[PDB]
Amino acid sequence: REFMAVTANNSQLLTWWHNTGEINTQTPVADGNVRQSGLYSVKVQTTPASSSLYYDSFVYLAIPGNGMSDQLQYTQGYNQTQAWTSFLYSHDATVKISRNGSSANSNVVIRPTSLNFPVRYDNQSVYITVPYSPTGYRFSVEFDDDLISLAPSGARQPENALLIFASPFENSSTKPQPGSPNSIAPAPGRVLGLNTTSASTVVFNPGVYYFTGHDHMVLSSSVTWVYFAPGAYVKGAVEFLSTASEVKASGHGVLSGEQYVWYADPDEGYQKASGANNNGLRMWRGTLGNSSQTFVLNGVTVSAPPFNSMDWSGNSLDLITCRVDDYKQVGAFYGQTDGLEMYPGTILQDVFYHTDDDGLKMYYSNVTARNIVMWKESVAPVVEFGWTPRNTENVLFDNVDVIHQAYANAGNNPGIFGAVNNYLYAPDGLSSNHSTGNSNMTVRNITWSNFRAEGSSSALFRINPIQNLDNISIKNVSIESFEPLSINTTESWMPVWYDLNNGKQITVTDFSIEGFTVGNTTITASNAASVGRIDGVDPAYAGSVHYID
Ligand SMILES: *[C@@H]1O[C@H](CO)[C@@H](O)[C@H](O)[C@H]1NC(C)=O
Ligand SMILES: *[C@@H]1O[C@H](CO)[C@@H](O)[C@H](O)[C@H]1NC(C)=O
Ligand SMILES: *[C@@H]1O[C@H](CO)[C@@H](O)[C@H](O)[C@H]1NC(C)=O
Ligand SMILES: *[C@@H]1O[C@H](CO)[C@@H](O)[C@H](O)[C@H]1NC(C)=O
Ligand SMILES: *[C@@H]1O[C@H](CO)[C@@H](O)[C@H](O)[C@H]1NC(C)=O
Ligand SMILES: *[C@@H]1O[C@H](CO)[C@@H](O)[C@H](O)[C@H]1NC(C)=O
Ligand SMILES: *[C@@H]1O[C@H](CO)[C@@H](O)[C@H](O)[C@H]1NC(C)=O
Ligand SMILES: *[C@@H]1O[C@H](CO)[C@@H](O)[C@H](O)[C@H]1NC(C)=O
Ligand SMILES: *[C@@H]1O[C@H](CO)[C@@H](O)[C@H](O)[C@H]1NC(C)=O
């Protein structure tokens, strides 16, 4: 018969497909269609590797502008595309990757490179044995002959990226049981009525769904759980109205905002905001009243966000907490595509972030973030914590691997660990005025450990002490290479700041740096400025920065 895709649905492997898959690299795909990579084909086989059957795994594709060329002006202007595929597994599986048909056998680099997965090359195909892990893996497959140079960085990256998201099977907490009378499973196509449903659980089963570029998934206050099934692709953005103790979004399906123009404003008919009112539609939005609320985000893949990926409403933002895992953000070519907000008590792990702005927002206390892979694009620091003075304490960011960076200039506020200026007086985050700080607030007990930057990289840190700093320690951080010196992006700095009202000097205390390597050079105090390129530490703080071995 006519060739058909064959997907896996067993206790060891699960892959899916979309019959309305559309190969398109220039315009918006049809409503009921899903942009599919015409360059990469993926099949997965549960080990042991035998002449047995290999199952197809749909390869998604996100492109800058989302086919809207009059939208490219809001991207960094590169011609890079991002393809990806996800699958669930419970046992070691071999991933077979194929291309065009005129493609020669090219070498591939897996990122993070720490994975060290077995890689075989056979007849214009790449065989990657992916080991099973209760936390799955998120990695980039980069074909040498597909690498290009991004100006002015010169960063060598894939023109056509391919991401693989191998996740563990879903449990009773992340996958609703079918047939519950208190849940509603909207059929494929335009989705309507979820904003007034009496259901408490929205279930999107395999299939394509879409709100428009002029409407999003507002869930009734009654809704506390949104599930995107593996094989489900939903075009829209979600907003809970519920103020219950917990609201949840799970499943390994896709939530794509490809239909919204950049900075789409719900209050202005989803049109580009009138004047940067910071009302660009978020992919994850919620609201809390007087009671605390936990936001659970699990397994979902968010693509093409039209603005900041997430933000909650309220005056009691410290009453919110997050629990996210096995979550991904791909195809975020638009600017200001911030990663999630991590409210007090948050625990985030095994996340993949493709972002053109503030990545890890360290704005709240008692936060734990680990096992993150970041494909930072061209703006904002990897880690941000400097738009507004605040009291923040007890933060741990461990095992973070920035696989790529493509900064252009200083105005991009580059750097791994950054803290831009006070947005109230320097909205763009850059200004010589360092006298708008608050000597009454302090950020303390901060630990950034096991950070890693592959390829060329920006400065280790560019921190503006807008409030006091105390007990901040960097442990094990390696920068494979620095970006071109001429672009003003590799030197770290930390200028003395002053209180806005009192004029009192902002203090920095116990800022330690341990295990900092640049290439094959282990940095130390007598190495700081030489290789480490740490030149900007203000003499007033020099005594507070310690290079311990
Ligand atoms: C197999 O996977 C499909 C989606 O690809 C899912 O809808 C279905 O429930 C699975 N079959 C079962 C019940 O094992
Ligand atoms: C994409 O941009 C790269 C440089 O960033 C360039 O080398 C490549 O030719 C471009 N794609 C094409 C084939 O137009
Ligand atoms: C519910 O959503 C629809 C879809 O756009 C919208 O037209 C309607 O005004 C909304 N009703 C509510 C709950 O305000
Ligand atoms: C952080 O945790 C500590 C102790 O667990 C607690 O005293 C403090 O209030 C917390 N801060 C916030 C903003 O939740
Ligand atoms: C400091 O932060 C760490 C996070 O690694 C936490 O385990 C510890 O309890 C905090 N200690 C203080 C000062 O409460
Ligand atoms: C910025 O610094 C200047 C000192 O040069 C100070 O007078 C001003 O109040 C600060 N912030 C602003 C622009 O309000
Ligand atoms: C710091 O606290 C003092 C005393 O309450 C106050 O006068 C001053 O304005 C505060 N500084 C800032 C940055 O608000
Ligand atoms: C720092 O790196 C060393 C070498 O791999 C490792 O043994 C140690 O546990 C790391 N420390 C932290 C902060 O995890
Ligand atoms: C980079 O910085 C140097 C010194 O700070 C400056 O002279 C140069 O103009 C900057 N390059 C540009 C234009 O980005």
XYZ file of C-alpha atoms and ligand atoms in Angstrom:
675
model
C 0.000 0.000 0.000
C 0.951 3.666 0.027
C 3.684 4.489 2.509
C 2.379 5.583 5.880
C 4.122 6.722 9.056
C 4.303 4.033 11.739
C 4.358 5.255 15.339
C 5.257 3.432 18.552
C 2.732 2.925 21.338
C 4.175 0.379 23.745
C 5.416 0.239 27.344
C 8.954 1.154 26.256
C 8.513 3.645 23.442
C 5.976 6.185 22.238
C 6.252 8.383 19.163
C 3.616 10.283 17.206
C 2.719 11.822 13.868
C 0.576 14.527 12.260
C -1.225 13.733 9.025
C -1.760 17.450 8.440
C 1.988 17.999 8.606
C 3.053 20.725 6.167
C 6.529 21.392 4.760
C 6.797 25.175 4.534
C 9.804 27.417 5.170
C 8.386 30.797 4.126
C 4.712 31.359 4.942
C 2.138 30.601 7.684
C 0.994 26.991 7.571
C -2.725 26.279 7.189
C -4.808 26.432 10.387
C -5.242 22.689 10.777
C -1.659 22.100 9.640
C 1.653 21.660 11.470
C 4.940 22.994 10.115
C 7.122 19.954 9.508
C 10.855 19.808 8.815
C 11.565 18.920 5.203
C 15.229 18.390 6.054
C 15.291 15.968 9.020
C 13.566 12.595 9.417
C 13.631 10.810 12.762
C 12.901 7.224 13.746
C 13.347 5.629 17.163
C 14.162 2.034 18.089
C 14.086 0.546 21.597
C 17.312 -1.389 22.216
C 18.727 -3.910 21.782
C 19.260 -2.692 18.223
C 17.938 -5.331 15.834
C 16.602 -5.636 12.281
C 13.348 -5.087 14.156
C 11.087 -2.102 13.562
C 12.060 1.591 13.807
C 9.201 3.982 14.541
C 8.685 7.401 12.968
C 8.871 10.495 15.161
C 7.362 13.703 13.825
C 9.952 16.435 13.332
C 8.453 19.877 14.022
C 9.804 23.113 12.543
C 9.761 26.697 13.799
C 11.108 29.552 11.686
C 11.651 33.254 12.419
C 8.535 35.312 11.729
C 6.392 32.176 11.583
C 5.965 32.685 7.858
C 5.080 36.333 8.431
C 7.895 38.128 6.604
C 6.614 41.546 7.727
C 7.455 40.304 11.216
C 11.130 39.427 10.643
C 12.081 42.971 11.647
C 11.402 41.842 15.227
C 13.970 39.025 15.111
C 17.774 39.211 15.107
C 17.681 38.770 11.344
C 19.392 35.379 11.123
C 18.246 32.639 8.729
C 18.453 29.900 11.356
C 15.515 27.540 11.832
C 14.750 25.178 14.684
C 13.491 21.647 14.110
C 12.645 19.321 16.966
C 11.001 16.050 17.857
C 9.861 14.548 21.148
C 9.159 11.016 22.292
C 8.425 9.129 25.482
C 10.493 6.127 26.559
C 11.327 3.820 29.472
C 14.348 2.011 27.995
C 17.520 2.847 26.028
C 16.532 3.751 22.476
C 18.469 4.300 19.275
C 17.568 7.490 17.428
C 18.044 7.348 13.646
C 18.393 10.717 11.898
C 18.213 11.086 8.100
C 18.427 14.100 5.745
C 17.529 15.220 2.186
C 18.951 12.405 0.083
C 21.724 14.356 -1.611
C 23.315 14.901 1.791
C 26.792 13.462 2.298
C 27.786 11.713 5.522
C 28.632 14.651 7.794
C 29.983 14.514 11.356
C 27.609 15.560 14.156
C 28.215 17.283 17.472
C 25.799 16.620 20.341
C 25.146 19.466 22.785
C 25.484 19.446 25.686
C 28.744 17.715 24.751
C 28.838 16.257 28.261
C 26.284 13.645 27.227
C 28.831 11.531 25.351
C 26.111 9.407 23.730
C 27.134 6.553 21.400
C 27.086 7.761 17.786
C 27.172 5.574 14.680
C 27.300 6.642 11.022
C 25.627 4.432 8.412
C 24.479 5.114 4.836
C 23.639 8.804 5.185
C 22.144 8.303 8.646
C 23.210 9.066 12.199
C 22.520 6.534 14.953
C 22.448 8.001 18.451
C 21.937 5.557 21.301
C 20.033 7.599 23.865
C 20.289 6.087 27.384
C 17.125 6.014 29.444
C 16.850 8.477 32.314
C 13.937 9.191 34.665
C 14.474 12.845 33.711
C 14.970 12.267 29.999
C 17.261 14.384 27.865
C 17.041 17.532 25.772
C 19.855 17.982 23.253
C 20.954 19.502 19.949
C 22.221 17.469 16.975
C 24.522 19.658 14.898
C 25.735 18.616 11.448
C 29.183 20.065 10.710
C 28.293 20.872 7.097
C 25.251 22.781 8.348
C 27.232 25.212 10.505
C 27.216 28.884 9.543
C 28.697 32.089 10.936
C 26.429 34.516 12.765
C 27.641 38.119 12.440
C 29.219 39.898 14.193
C 29.789 37.139 16.730
C 31.253 34.662 14.264
C 29.582 32.034 16.432
C 29.597 28.726 14.567
C 26.074 27.300 14.836
C 23.616 25.063 12.927
C 21.704 26.915 10.229
C 18.982 24.319 10.598
C 18.856 23.196 14.216
C 17.502 19.786 15.238
C 16.527 19.254 18.878
C 15.679 15.906 20.419
C 13.470 15.776 23.514
C 13.468 12.284 25.032
C 11.117 12.311 28.015
C 9.925 9.674 30.514
C 6.389 8.275 30.306
C 3.592 10.280 31.888
C 2.195 9.367 35.308
C -1.176 9.948 36.987
C -0.085 13.445 38.012
C 0.755 14.623 34.487
C -1.822 12.733 32.397
C -5.583 12.829 33.103
C -7.545 9.602 32.977
C -9.912 9.559 29.987
C -13.669 9.903 30.415
C -13.893 11.958 33.611
C -17.229 13.816 33.758
C -15.382 16.840 35.121
C -13.102 17.219 32.124
C -13.720 18.450 28.583
C -11.893 17.168 25.489
C -12.370 19.761 22.709
C -12.330 18.336 19.184
C -9.735 19.330 16.522
C -9.963 22.761 14.927
C -10.981 26.142 16.287
C -11.279 25.816 20.090
C -14.180 27.620 21.736
C -15.820 27.904 25.152
C -12.968 26.889 27.445
C -13.317 30.283 29.099
C -16.778 29.462 30.473
C -16.658 25.687 30.841
C -17.636 24.064 34.139
C -14.867 21.523 33.661
C -11.810 21.572 35.920
C -9.671 19.666 33.419
C -9.108 20.507 29.749
C -7.781 17.577 27.709
C -6.279 18.078 24.239
C -5.963 14.649 22.659
C -3.797 13.796 19.636
C -4.643 16.281 16.904
C -4.290 19.905 15.805
C -6.093 22.743 17.572
C -6.055 26.486 17.228
C -7.354 29.702 18.618
C -6.586 32.504 16.211
C -3.987 35.211 15.988
C -6.841 37.162 17.581
C -7.784 35.019 20.592
C -6.164 32.768 23.196
C -6.988 29.990 25.636
C -8.609 31.794 28.556
C -9.615 29.064 30.997
C -12.638 29.491 33.271
C -11.959 29.910 37.003
C -13.191 26.336 37.237
C -10.207 25.022 35.222
C -7.199 23.892 37.242
C -5.586 21.466 34.783
C -4.691 21.704 31.097
C -3.269 18.647 29.388
C -1.559 18.568 25.987
C -1.286 14.960 24.954
C 1.730 13.586 23.122
C 0.662 14.048 19.510
C -1.362 17.155 20.306
C -0.416 20.482 18.731
C -2.219 23.584 19.963
C -1.843 27.051 18.477
C -2.551 29.613 21.179
C -1.476 30.855 24.628
C -2.896 29.882 28.024
C -4.336 32.021 30.793
C -5.959 30.588 33.920
C -8.682 32.578 35.666
C -8.653 30.114 38.553
C -7.257 31.252 41.889
C -7.385 27.748 43.374
C -4.428 26.468 45.427
C -3.090 24.856 42.239
C -3.322 25.280 38.455
C -1.546 22.848 36.144
C -0.392 22.512 32.546
C 1.108 19.168 31.601
C 1.571 16.681 28.805
C 4.196 16.396 26.091
C 2.079 18.060 23.454
C 2.920 21.423 21.910
C 1.640 24.920 22.725
C 2.555 27.230 19.819
C 2.017 30.973 19.507
C 2.930 31.046 15.806
C -0.378 32.747 15.009
C 0.265 35.851 17.138
C 2.214 38.769 15.716
C 5.119 39.932 17.871
C 3.917 41.815 20.960
C 0.300 40.800 20.329
C -1.908 42.739 22.772
C -5.159 40.980 23.862
C -6.691 44.330 24.855
C -5.918 45.815 21.424
C -7.464 42.937 19.496
C -4.247 40.915 19.478
C -2.581 43.555 17.340
C 0.999 44.673 17.917
C 0.826 46.811 21.077
C 0.431 50.539 20.372
C 3.538 51.600 22.270
C 5.549 48.963 24.142
C 3.013 48.816 26.972
C 4.480 45.509 28.195
C 1.145 43.875 27.467
C 2.452 41.404 24.931
C 0.538 38.134 25.273
C 2.291 35.610 27.560
C 2.293 31.876 26.810
C 1.693 31.204 30.509
C -0.456 33.659 32.456
C -2.302 33.274 35.726
C -3.810 35.249 38.586
C -3.959 34.846 42.345
C -6.185 36.467 44.927
C -5.473 36.365 48.652
C -4.620 32.664 48.739
C -1.267 31.166 47.697
C -1.077 29.229 44.445
C 1.224 26.621 42.952
C 1.772 26.521 39.191
C 2.726 23.088 37.907
C 4.238 23.006 34.405
C 5.349 19.582 33.183
C 6.557 18.009 29.936
C 5.036 20.665 27.649
C 6.835 22.199 24.679
C 6.162 25.875 24.054
C 7.013 27.251 20.623
C 7.196 30.676 19.020
C 6.152 32.818 21.994
C 5.111 36.339 20.876
C 6.560 37.995 23.984
C 7.707 37.159 27.516
C 6.921 33.467 27.959
C 5.295 33.875 31.363
C 3.909 36.248 34.041
C 1.196 36.075 36.713
C -1.123 38.951 37.726
C -1.578 40.296 41.243
C -0.133 42.389 44.073
C 0.637 39.238 46.042
C 3.195 37.743 43.650
C 5.138 36.209 46.537
C 2.186 33.908 47.204
C 2.840 32.065 43.940
C 5.280 29.174 43.597
C 6.279 27.025 40.607
C 7.097 23.363 40.017
C 8.297 22.806 36.468
C 10.043 19.830 34.889
C 10.818 18.347 31.491
C 9.724 21.642 29.880
C 10.918 23.242 26.635
C 10.760 26.575 24.808
C 11.753 26.388 21.146
C 11.553 28.712 18.154
C 11.737 31.918 20.186
C 13.264 34.116 17.466
C 11.375 37.258 18.503
C 12.989 39.691 20.903
C 11.885 39.873 24.546
C 11.125 36.129 24.586
C 11.933 35.826 28.301
C 11.955 32.428 29.967
C 9.641 31.590 32.901
C 9.209 33.570 36.094
C 10.294 31.467 39.066
C 8.305 32.682 42.056
C 9.159 31.951 45.734
C 9.887 28.323 46.557
C 10.159 27.340 42.901
C 11.826 24.102 41.868
C 12.618 23.914 38.148
C 14.540 21.038 36.573
C 15.365 19.479 33.211
C 14.356 22.425 31.086
C 15.420 23.519 27.609
C 15.307 27.245 26.828
C 15.687 28.888 23.429
C 15.449 32.586 24.245
C 16.221 36.008 22.815
C 16.110 37.779 26.199
C 16.361 37.336 29.982
C 16.761 33.609 30.530
C 16.958 32.688 34.207
C 15.142 35.426 36.095
C 16.528 35.476 39.614
C 13.897 37.822 41.036
C 12.624 35.681 43.892
C 13.805 33.934 47.043
C 14.149 30.251 47.880
C 14.432 29.166 44.234
C 16.071 25.967 43.011
C 16.815 25.609 39.294
C 18.845 22.719 37.857
C 19.715 20.680 34.756
C 19.016 23.388 32.193
C 20.145 23.621 28.563
C 20.039 27.124 27.121
C 20.374 28.274 23.535
C 20.750 31.989 24.329
C 20.297 34.090 21.196
C 21.352 37.749 21.019
C 19.962 39.794 23.902
C 20.016 39.907 27.698
C 22.197 37.857 30.062
C 21.785 34.117 30.635
C 21.046 34.889 34.270
C 19.373 38.193 35.074
C 18.719 39.888 38.400
C 19.028 43.610 37.839
C 16.001 45.568 36.610
C 14.719 46.502 40.028
C 16.335 46.541 43.462
C 14.971 43.745 45.609
C 15.450 41.551 48.662
C 16.241 38.084 47.327
C 17.825 35.184 49.188
C 18.504 31.455 49.124
C 18.875 30.737 45.429
C 20.561 27.794 43.744
C 21.130 27.452 40.008
C 22.963 24.206 39.357
C 24.082 22.417 36.214
C 23.264 24.963 33.505
C 24.709 24.495 30.029
C 24.445 27.418 27.618
C 25.114 25.496 24.390
C 25.173 28.646 22.246
C 25.376 32.432 22.332
C 25.199 34.941 19.470
C 25.515 38.393 21.015
C 26.317 41.367 18.821
C 27.216 44.361 20.983
C 27.301 45.785 24.517
C 23.826 47.247 24.181
C 22.623 43.644 24.257
C 23.523 43.489 27.965
C 25.437 40.215 27.387
C 27.005 37.960 29.974
C 26.385 34.690 31.774
C 25.581 36.278 35.139
C 24.137 39.726 34.615
C 22.188 42.417 36.440
C 21.302 45.355 34.186
C 20.546 48.931 35.268
C 17.398 50.223 36.993
C 14.663 50.087 34.354
C 12.898 53.044 36.008
C 15.688 55.361 34.858
C 17.433 53.276 32.188
C 14.673 51.217 30.493
C 17.208 49.685 28.103
C 19.295 48.388 30.999
C 22.419 50.397 30.117
C 23.460 53.728 31.656
C 26.437 55.336 33.380
C 24.255 56.529 36.267
C 24.912 54.064 39.112
C 23.193 56.196 41.752
C 19.649 54.821 41.711
C 20.194 51.801 43.928
C 18.666 50.898 47.269
C 21.091 50.420 50.165
C 18.270 48.960 52.247
C 17.748 45.826 50.180
C 20.111 42.891 49.799
C 20.506 39.825 47.599
C 22.186 37.110 49.656
C 23.080 33.422 49.758
C 23.174 32.922 45.996
C 24.850 29.871 44.450
C 25.436 29.445 40.720
C 27.114 26.091 40.224
C 28.274 23.926 37.354
C 27.607 26.445 34.593
C 29.019 25.734 31.158
C 29.207 27.742 27.939
C 30.032 25.877 24.741
C 31.278 27.739 21.671
C 32.174 31.433 21.845
C 30.776 33.187 24.917
C 30.033 36.565 26.485
C 31.558 37.857 29.744
C 31.366 35.769 32.908
C 29.487 38.600 34.589
C 28.219 42.158 34.135
C 26.619 43.028 37.449
C 25.187 46.368 38.537
C 24.759 46.219 42.335
C 21.392 47.980 42.460
C 21.065 46.604 45.998
C 23.648 45.055 48.309
C 25.225 41.720 47.431
C 26.274 39.145 50.005
C 27.404 35.527 49.993
C 27.230 34.959 46.241
C 29.403 32.093 45.051
C 30.218 30.827 41.568
C 31.385 27.196 41.652
C 32.654 25.418 38.538
C 32.016 27.472 35.428
C 33.763 26.843 32.103
C 33.788 29.108 29.055
C 35.049 27.141 26.052
C 35.893 30.362 24.224
C 35.318 34.134 24.274
C 33.483 36.014 21.534
C 35.485 38.506 19.445
C 36.982 41.176 21.701
C 36.033 43.946 19.254
C 32.313 43.589 20.002
C 32.538 44.599 23.674
C 31.003 41.395 24.999
C 33.653 39.393 26.864
C 34.833 41.678 29.651
C 33.148 41.247 33.016
C 32.518 44.310 35.157
C 30.911 45.488 38.392
C 30.924 49.285 38.981
C 30.290 50.789 42.416
C 26.693 51.896 42.975
C 25.009 54.436 45.238
C 21.678 54.727 47.058
C 19.108 56.811 45.151
C 18.104 58.874 48.191
C 20.868 58.509 50.824
C 23.882 58.486 48.529
C 25.118 55.583 50.645
C 27.480 53.269 48.752
C 26.012 49.921 47.765
C 27.990 47.096 49.378
C 29.241 43.822 47.908
C 30.392 41.048 50.203
C 31.761 37.521 49.869
C 31.528 37.217 46.102
C 33.579 34.073 45.484
C 34.663 32.450 42.242
C 35.669 28.792 42.246
C 36.415 26.365 39.424
C 36.411 28.985 36.658
C 38.069 27.698 33.483
C 38.411 29.371 30.075
C 39.352 26.802 27.481
C 42.137 24.773 29.070
C 43.156 27.528 31.495
C 42.136 27.272 35.151
C 41.619 30.869 36.319
C 42.831 32.315 39.620
C 43.365 35.768 41.161
C 46.647 36.042 39.245
C 44.749 34.933 36.146
C 41.515 36.932 36.492
C 42.142 39.744 33.998
C 44.668 37.901 31.826
C 42.596 34.974 30.538
C 39.335 35.335 32.474
C 38.940 38.846 31.013
C 37.648 40.092 34.366
C 38.674 43.748 34.101
C 35.696 45.799 35.269
C 35.557 44.911 38.975
C 35.429 48.268 40.741
C 38.420 48.895 43.038
C 35.870 49.513 45.778
C 34.709 45.901 45.442
C 38.005 44.227 44.520
C 38.492 43.197 48.140
C 35.082 41.502 48.160
C 35.708 39.284 45.115
C 37.623 36.171 46.127
C 39.139 33.591 43.797
C 39.218 30.486 45.991
C 40.692 27.229 44.688
C -1.186 5.133 21.970
O -0.809 6.489 21.692
C -1.919 7.315 21.304
C -1.349 8.633 20.816
O -0.301 8.425 19.880
C -2.865 7.470 22.488
O -3.950 8.315 22.135
C -3.388 6.091 22.900
O -4.123 6.221 24.112
C -2.244 5.068 23.095
N -2.808 3.730 23.130
C -2.915 3.069 24.279
C -4.217 3.227 25.051
O -2.023 2.345 24.723
C 22.436 32.100 6.306
O 23.360 32.985 6.954
C 24.723 32.506 6.909
C 25.566 33.495 7.697
O 24.959 33.818 8.941
C 25.188 32.361 5.453
O 26.499 31.816 5.423
C 24.227 31.444 4.686
O 24.590 31.397 3.314
C 22.795 31.970 4.825
N 21.863 31.083 4.161
C 21.760 31.112 2.837
C 22.244 29.886 2.075
O 21.313 32.084 2.224
C -15.113 33.738 26.115
O -14.197 33.597 25.025
C -14.763 34.047 23.781
C -13.796 33.653 22.685
O -13.109 34.785 22.179
C -15.049 35.553 23.855
O -15.659 35.987 22.647
C -15.983 35.850 25.036
O -16.105 37.255 25.202
C -15.446 35.219 26.332
N -16.433 35.356 27.387
C -16.049 35.710 28.609
C -15.944 34.605 29.653
O -15.774 36.874 28.916
C 12.328 31.988 52.098
O 12.425 30.869 52.989
C 12.641 31.272 54.363
C 12.846 30.007 55.180
O 12.326 28.868 54.505
C 11.457 32.114 54.852
O 11.690 32.553 56.181
C 11.273 33.322 53.929
O 10.128 34.060 54.329
C 11.120 32.849 52.477
N 11.018 33.988 51.590
C 9.965 34.101 50.789
C 9.802 35.412 50.031
O 9.139 33.198 50.644
C 21.346 29.156 51.332
O 20.909 28.700 50.047
C 21.018 27.268 49.917
C 20.715 26.913 48.474
O 21.716 26.056 47.941
C 20.088 26.583 50.919
O 20.241 25.175 50.829
C 20.440 27.033 52.331
O 19.497 26.500 53.244
C 20.457 28.558 52.436
N 20.963 28.928 53.743
C 20.422 29.941 54.410
C 21.302 31.165 54.624
O 19.267 29.921 54.844
C 20.829 59.416 37.594
O 22.069 59.955 38.069
C 22.012 61.385 38.239
C 23.410 61.853 38.568
O 24.184 61.997 37.387
C 20.977 61.738 39.307
O 20.908 63.146 39.472
C 19.612 61.197 38.875
O 18.654 61.460 39.889
C 19.715 59.683 38.610
N 18.458 59.146 38.114
C 17.595 59.914 37.453
C 17.915 60.256 36.004
O 16.556 60.337 37.962
C 16.966 53.568 52.676
O 16.348 53.674 53.969
C 16.370 55.020 54.489
C 15.823 54.967 55.903
O 14.512 54.423 55.926
C 15.567 55.943 53.569
O 15.601 57.272 54.070
C 16.165 55.897 52.155
O 15.374 56.675 51.267
C 16.227 54.447 51.657
N 16.896 54.395 50.370
C 16.210 54.097 49.270
C 17.006 53.635 48.061
O 14.982 54.177 49.204
C 32.866 21.287 41.161
O 33.484 20.469 40.158
C 34.182 19.346 40.728
C 34.921 18.654 39.598
O 34.023 18.003 38.711
C 33.190 18.435 41.457
O 33.886 17.353 42.062
C 32.447 19.238 42.532
O 31.441 18.436 43.129
C 31.808 20.484 41.926
N 31.248 21.296 42.990
C 29.967 21.644 42.973
C 29.640 23.053 43.443
O 29.064 20.888 42.607
C 33.817 48.914 22.287
O 34.297 49.502 23.505
C 35.424 50.379 23.287
C 35.926 50.809 24.654
O 34.900 50.710 25.635
C 34.998 51.568 22.417
O 36.126 52.389 22.140
C 34.385 51.079 21.100
O 33.815 52.186 20.417
C 33.307 50.006 21.330
N 32.957 49.404 20.057
C 31.742 49.573 19.545
C 31.533 50.779 18.640
O 30.807 48.800 19.770
